[PDB]
Design a protein around this nucleic acid. Structure first.
Lengths: 100, 97
RNA sequence: GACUCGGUGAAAUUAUAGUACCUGUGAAGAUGCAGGUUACCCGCGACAGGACGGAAAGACCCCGUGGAGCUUUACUGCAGCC
RNA sequence: AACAGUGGUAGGAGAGCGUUCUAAGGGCUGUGAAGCCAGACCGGAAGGACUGGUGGAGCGCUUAGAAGUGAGAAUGCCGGUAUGAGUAGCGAAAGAGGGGUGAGAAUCCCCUCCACCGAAUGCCUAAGGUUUCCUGAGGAAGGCUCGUCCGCUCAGGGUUAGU
RNA sequence: GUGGGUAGGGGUGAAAUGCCAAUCGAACCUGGAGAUAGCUGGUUCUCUCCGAAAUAGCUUUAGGGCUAGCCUCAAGGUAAGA
RNA sequence: GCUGUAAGCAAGCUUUGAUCCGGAGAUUUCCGAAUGGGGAAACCCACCACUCGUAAUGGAGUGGUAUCCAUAUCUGAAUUCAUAGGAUAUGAGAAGGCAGACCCGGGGAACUGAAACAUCUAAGUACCCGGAGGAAGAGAAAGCAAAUGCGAUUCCCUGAGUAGCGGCGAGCGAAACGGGAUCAGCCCAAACCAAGAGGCUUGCCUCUUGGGGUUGUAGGACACUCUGUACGGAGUUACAAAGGAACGAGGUAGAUGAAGAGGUCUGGAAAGGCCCGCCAUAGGAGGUAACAGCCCUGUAGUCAAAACUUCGUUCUCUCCUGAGUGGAUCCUGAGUACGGCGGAACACGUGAAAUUCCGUCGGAAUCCGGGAGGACCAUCUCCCAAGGCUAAAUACUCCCUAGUGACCGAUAGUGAACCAGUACCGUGAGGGAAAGGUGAAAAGCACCCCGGAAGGGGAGUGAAAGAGAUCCUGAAACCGUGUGCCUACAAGUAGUCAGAGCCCGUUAACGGGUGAUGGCGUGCCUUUUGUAGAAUGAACCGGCGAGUUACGAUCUCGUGCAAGGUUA
């Protein structure tokens, strides 16, 4: 339901409460990248390219239902509504009625 | 079975037969008719709804195993030759349908 | 071929067996039962007397109110033919 | 409480223990469930419990009910592993020597001697086979042993018809 | 050798019960079929209470069965029972 | 956001609205009923028109070209008419398939039982073959049945394992009455009349079209009185067929959608404990780093389909008279019904045998008639065969949605949770497997050392690396390595009871392990008079593997009600 890129809290998990934006979404697997959240060291083969190989510092992406948007005003973790005249179903954030 | 010895339902003869029509004027025990206190009008229709006669298989006889001491305008299909004494000495009519 | 060294390496079988001999008793023919006498522990190379050795729920015999094939003046019938 | 009894096949009766699921609540689990392994614990048995270790998400108790309700024997079925046993066998039939390759060579390549078929073990082309052909790499697996090698593996290449 | 027919209570046989895809006194497959089996093998946890028979009449029947016979459970009768 | 599996690389595409999901199309090489012909399935070869191209042959595209039947049209043999037949065009004709089922019909066994077997049963079962339909078959009386009668078939329960049938043995076994589900009845034929044609000796009588006409204590014709041609009724499912167009409701896509990160603690992670707040026509489920009503998809309620449908109502359209009275006579189902012989189906096995249906012989009445009322006859009661249509009540599933399991949890459940009818096995019809799980995600082990390389040891990754490719759990047979105690004078179903030495300290107990040696002692099971058995069975280990279940009958036990109990 979340898209790239809205402002995003982390409900639960090891990173319970950090925030960041979305680098990429993966909707068929129901799983979303966030910057700097589930930051995981990965060992990589020396490529082709780059020749460095080494260790990378990426993020493995996060399941969608551990992610909420924010009110722009209160900054609260809020659930989602819809129905917006001339807005093509633009998200009513609860604690009505801010868009996006 | 009998091993192979010709068994007991074959060493014994038939006894025919069964009727093309046999009618069972059944049943009225006579002390059933003390269900009327005092009562009259003993008909099978007034006995069907009172459960003395379960099902009336082509009429009923009245069978003198009992006594009353009650008068009853009995309206029945058949009677014993004793039920023409208990109903009769009580003074109730014993009308054959 | 076998024997030995080096490479590779099965099967049948198999209730567990650290499995001596003889005389007897036993389902009447013992390694394991009783009595007696021998026998240090473990291997290798052979032979095959025994384990009623393996192999094949016996081909022989007999039973099954089991089956098949065949035969005929066995029974009841079919086609065929007259 | 007194008195007597208490071997046992085929079998009859009675009382129980187990396992799985459902139904009432009640009750243990990340402060570690089930299952697994250990142990000298308790009841008449079938059997239960407790502590440890492994195991990482489910589970028992009581009370009833349902039953794909219990294993040692079917020359049962499937899978695994023994025994024999480092034993039989290694599939007719001469290689030897130098060099080379490679980590490793009797078995691979090259050379040189020798040996066998030579009305076949020669060539050509059917039946079939469907790439086994050639090159370039590998080498675990198939090769009845190795193996740098192969009809094995890969990666390419490979068959031209008016007669 | 090629090409091709003869199909299973049938074919085929210079005939033996041979051969018909490694199978022949009736080929293989799939079903009726979970054919039937008086016959063999197997019949999975515990304790207690009692506890048999291998005899007879019959039986296409003798290694099957059916009544008795002996066992067990329950209820009556009552002290019959020895 | 997308370029499916596929986890990566290149190249790209998209809110000038992409990827996806539905509707409606178009595209759709070749084989296959294959259909121009041949064919050994996935290929060859034609011909007729038309096109492309070469100077032409060669070559290439586009359609058509089977067989049967039917409608017609030309021809039209021996043989004259004329026919057979031949040629042509027209047919959105039909041959094939498959839901392995259910339903008709034609054929149609055996094994099993009867304790043998041949009458019977098994069984009109399986199997083969023809039919199609979503259902089929049957059906409006020559029906039951014997009164105050019922009124088309079908299905269910009783009736009842009764009447019966049967070497009357095994076994087979109905109907009708009673109660429901469903509930509709009607056309043809025949006379009579009208129009054609077609012959005969005018006359006469013989085919089609159009009315009329649908029957039983008789109806129709015919005739005589009425009555309509509507505004009344019907109607595409029978009732006769057949068209459209509007209103509403489902279905093939959806869209909306309530309430908290509550705090703290344990933790790798809360969804868990404790202390707490809310929503709820939503606490169905499924994910969510671990067991969420409140995190997500959703759920409950509402609402929408441009296009296809499926259904219900209307409008349009289409179509249509019903009765009395009489009976001078004409009809009411012909090589048919019945009857002989021979069979089969009826529960009825050839019988005292009614009834139906076939083969073959015979063969009637046609209202003053005729048939049924379990041989047959009279009386009496029903009812018209010898023509046809008939939805629903019913049986079914390869199926498609939504759902439920005291169903299974990978040797189970379909054979197949896995690229399964695959691999393999067979010439061939056919047989026919095994094979699930890293982690919460690849974070799938960068780097160093050994090694040719697999294979390891450190290093990091994560909670775990003993989790690292059969990758969660990992038992036992087995195979090891260390060992504490025993063994090289010993005869052994290998144990038990005794028993010192030596070694350890426990689910704290007249402890545990080895036990030098002594007394006793020949496996387990089946089958047997008797088995240690030299009688059978087993190499071991683990898993699977056998007394029920459905429906009745009987007895005890229990419960309710008691000459009254249960209801399908």
């Amino acid at each position: 339901h979340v898209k790239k890129g809205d402002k995003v809290m982390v409900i639960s998990g090891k990173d319970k409460g950090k925030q960041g934006t979305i680098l990429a979404a993966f909707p068929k697997k129901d799983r979303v990248l966030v910057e700097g959240v589930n930051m995981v060291k990965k060992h990589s083969k020396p490529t082709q390219a780059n020749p460095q190989g080494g260790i990378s510092n990426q993020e493995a992406p996060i399941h969608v239902s551990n992610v909420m948007p924010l009110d722009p005003k209160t900054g609260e973790v809020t659930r989602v509504g819809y129905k917006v005249e001339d807005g093509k179903k633009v998200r009513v954030a609860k604690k009505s009625g801010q868009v996006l | 079975f009998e091993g192979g010895q010709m068994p007991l339902f074959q060493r014994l003869p038939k006894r025919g037969f069964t009727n093309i029509n046999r009618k069972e004027y059944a049943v009225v025990n006579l002390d059933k008719l003390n269900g009327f206190a005092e009562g009259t009008e003993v008909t099978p229709e007034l006995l069907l709804e009172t459960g003395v006669i379960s099902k009336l298989n082509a009429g009923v006889k009245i069978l003198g195993n009992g006594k009353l001491e009650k008068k009853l305008t009995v309206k029945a299909n058949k009677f014993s030759a004793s039920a023409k004494e208990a109903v009769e000495a009580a003074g109730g009519t014993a009308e054959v349908i």
